[PDB]
Structure 1
Amino acid sequence: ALQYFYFLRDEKDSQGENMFLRCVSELVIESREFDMILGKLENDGSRKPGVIDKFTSDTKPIINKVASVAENKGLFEEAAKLYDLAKNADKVLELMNKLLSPVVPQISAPQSNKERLKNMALSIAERYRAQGISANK
């Protein structure tokens, strides 16, 4: 879909350009294919580019838009993912603390040693904290 939308620019001029941008924006929203479209995992090394990024530019504003929406829906994980791309490190940890915090209180029998919110917790800490950590103490 991205490849096709990109053709829209082929008609060079404003209007069409915005139409292209809106179309991409519309694609990201509601398709919710964030990783594919927007990018993924830092391991330092900024984003690993999404397909759109290869095309480039307005990508930060789209992320904020998507992320806020995620907040409405309460699609946590998506929000965390989105904020990572946003590079709002402090925001990420805070949302993150909330996610891990609940699920901690509850009743027992869980927590395999390999994947979920806890695992997510481990990822971020190892990941951010060593590196020039921008988050609040």
Structure 2
Amino acid sequence: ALQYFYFLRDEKDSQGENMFLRCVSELVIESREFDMILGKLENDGSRKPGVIDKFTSDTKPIINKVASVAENKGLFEEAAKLYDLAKNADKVLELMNKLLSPVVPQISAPQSNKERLKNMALSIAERYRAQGISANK
């Protein structure tokens, strides 16, 4: 879909350009294919580019838009993912603390040693904290 939307620019001029941008924006929203479209995992090394990024530019504003929406829906994980791309490190941890915090209180029998919110917790800490950590103490 991205490849096709990109053709829209082929008609060079404003209007069409915005139409292209809106179309991409519309694609990201509601398709919710964030990783594919927007990008993924830092391991330092900024984003690993999404397909759109290869095309480039307005990508930060789209992320904020998507992320806020995620907040409405309460699609946590998506929000965390989105904020990572946003590079709002402090925001990520805070949302993150909330996610891990609940699920901690509850009743027992869980927590395999390999994947979920806890695992997510481990990822971020190892990941951010060593590196020039921008988050609040």
Residues 115-134 of structure 1: CA deviation (Å, up to 9, x unaligned) = 00000000000000000000
**Local SS of the residue matching 1:132:** coil
Residues 55-81 of structure 1: CA deviation (Å, up to 9, x unaligned) = 000000000000000000000000000
**Local SS of the residue matching 2:106:** coil
TM-score relative to the length of structure 1 = 1.00
Residues 77-115 of structure 1: CA deviation (Å, up to 9, x unaligned) = 000000000000000000000000000000000000000
User: d(CA) in 1 for partners of 2:48 and 2:23?
Assistant: 22
Runs of 4+ in 1 over 4 A off after TM superposition: none
**Local SS of the residue matching 2:42:** coil
User: d(CA) in 2 for partners of 1:38 and 1:120?
Assistant: 19
Number of equivalent positions: 137
**Local SS of the residue matching 1:93:** helix
User: d(CA) in 2 for partners of 1:54 and 1:47?
Assistant: 11
Match in the other structure for 1:118: 118
Match in the other structure for 2:88: 88
Specify every segment of 5 or more residues in structure 1 that has no aligned partner in the other structure, as ranges.
none
Specify every segment of 5 or more residues in structure 2 that has no aligned partner in the other structure, as ranges.
none
Cα offset, 1:44, TM superposition:
0.0
**Local SS of the residue matching 2:18:** helix
User: d(CA) in 1 for partners of 2:104 and 2:112?
Assistant: 14
CA RMSD of the aligned region, Å? 0.0
TM-score relative to the length of structure 2 = 1.00
User: d(CA) in 1 for partners of 2:60 and 2:80?
Assistant: 15
Cα offset, 1:32, TM superposition:
0.0
**Local SS of the residue matching 2:75:** coil
Q: Determine what percentage of the aligned residue pairs are the same residue.
A: 100
Cα offset, 1:40, TM superposition:
0.0
